[PDB]
């Protein structure tokens, strides 16, 4: 198993690359993760205060998430699928992402888009494709 | 791998085991699926219109998914860890409850408790242990 980790710090961008492993964090409070293997691809991106993206990746699984701001996504691509969530919170609105692909999985696609003021969640599961996409804006 | 479904039918209680996949739905509109190995445990439980449990494990993980009525429980138990997930709605109130454990997660727990009227979401990332408990009540 390949894991990486990149921790934000200020006024900077952090990378950590191992194998297929991919994590990139910016800024203070800014923390991005993941396992993967030879054959997947896991990429977690967080930027700003409050951003958790966590990619995890067996078999041919591809897991990518983008976390900004009061935010996490979080990719599970279990043996195969692309997994991908993005998630953009702002303070006092958190915006939470799940995408999970795995061969349990009833439906081939599971797309949530997700747009609003307050707190905003998104949660998809797929054999093939999950996507998930939120924003939460200020109340 | 195992795999395991069982489909609900008018007033019956299905149940697929297949080695450590155990799946149990009952009722018209209930779901239970999931994906095991040897040393892995995934177990799901599905009763009511609209529930769907998806139990997702590798290595030594052990993944547990409960969704009654309007709900969606999925466990993502993904090389180690207990990820479990119980959700209960009601017509025009969807549960959707999501557990993942993975080497990749921050936090060795991590506790989500939700309850209210309307829509409710919890989401839940751990290395150890992730648990979510959803309760969506009649607006």
Redo the contacts between chains.
């Keep these: 198993?390949y894991?990486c980790r990149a921790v934000g710090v200020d006024a900077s961008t952090v990378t950590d690359v191992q194998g297929t492993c991919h994590a990139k964090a910016t800024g203070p409070g800014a923390?991005a993760?993941?396992?993967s293997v030879d054959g997947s691809t896991?990429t977690a991106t967080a930027t700003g205060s409050g951003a958790?993206a966590?990619?995890?990746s067996?078999g041919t699984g591809t897991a990518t998430t983008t976390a900004t701001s009061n935010a996490?996504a979080?990719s599970?691509a279990?043996?195969q699928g692309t997994a991908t969530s993005t998630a953009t919170g702002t303070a006092a609105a958190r915006a939470?992402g799940?995408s999970?692909t795995?061969?349990?999985?009833?439906e081939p696609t599971q797309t949530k888009t997700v747009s609003g003021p307050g707190a905003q969640?998104a949660?998809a599961?797929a054999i093939d494709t999950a996507t998930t996409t939120v924003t939460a804006s200020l109340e």
């Design positions: 198993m894991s923390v993760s993941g396992t896991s958790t966590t990619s995890t067996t996490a979080t599970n279990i043996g939470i799940s999970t795995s061969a349990s999985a009833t969640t949660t599961i």
